[PDB]
């Protein structure tokens with residue numbers, strides 16, 4: 001039973017995390033929860049192959065010990081995990097070598113790929129997501145009064161091209177070429193604390209492609225303050241190299 005990357009078996013709501021909506025369970029089957037050995041959620045991540053999870057380097061910077069971490073796959077509820085959820089210990093950590101905010105976790109065992117646990121697709125190397133492309137972020141981060149705490153949420157965010165995002169009114173030059181921006185400039189919808197390390201995916205014809213890793217922002221969901229994501233396409237060669245070498 002082979003499953004194509006980026007093709008959920010439960011079609012997502014795509015409601016047009018603060019704002020957005022609670023996802024249909026298992027409609028974002030690459031979303032993982034990165035947890036302490038005691039089962040405390042602290043970051044998201046994205047399954048990109050049965051043995052590999054992509055996350056933000058800042059999620060791992062406190063401990064270089066793989067035993068500090070475990071990965072929860074197939075979940076919908078944060079607290080009361082579903083019976084099919086897989087909990088897999090991390091074997092090795094690989095931080096991006098130029099110190100950008102992206103990292104790989106090699107799992108101690110491959111995840112079992114099912115209709116609820118499926119990898120996201122990687123983008124082509126150096127792909128640029130065009131201004132205004134509609135994408136989605138997912139996670140179990142905080143909700144700032146918008147409902148759904150404790151459940152996996154999604155939010156539709158359009159990409160804001162870097163040259164726009166860097167304007168004074170927005171992020172005032174801070175965004176690097178190895179980052180991208182996404183958000184609604186009227187505010188109200190955004191990734192927030194506890195979402196970092198998770199995916200920003202953009203639908204292309206018949207599948208979702210992982211274009212961003214939730215990284216940072218100036219608060220959550222503020223008007224004129226879109227979130228910043230690591231631009232995954234600038235790291236595909238590095239990611240593929242790590243997977244090939246390990």
Ligand SMILES: CCCCCCCCNC(=O)[C@H](Cc1ccc(OCc2ccc3ccccc3n2)cc1)NC(=O)[C@H]1CC[C@H](CN)CC1
Pocket residue numbers: 036041042043058059062063068141190191192193194195196214215216217218219220221226227228
């Ligand atoms: C006492 C703090 C414990 C951390 C749990 C709260 C996690 C909340 N996460 C954040 O604040 C992360 C940063 C963060 C901080 C700490 C962190 O993990 C701490 C940690 C994690 C594992 C550890 C293992 C052994 C020892 C200490 C450890 N400490 C992970 C992520 N930033 C974000 O989620 C961003 C997402 C984009 C948004 C704008 N659109 C703004 C917020």
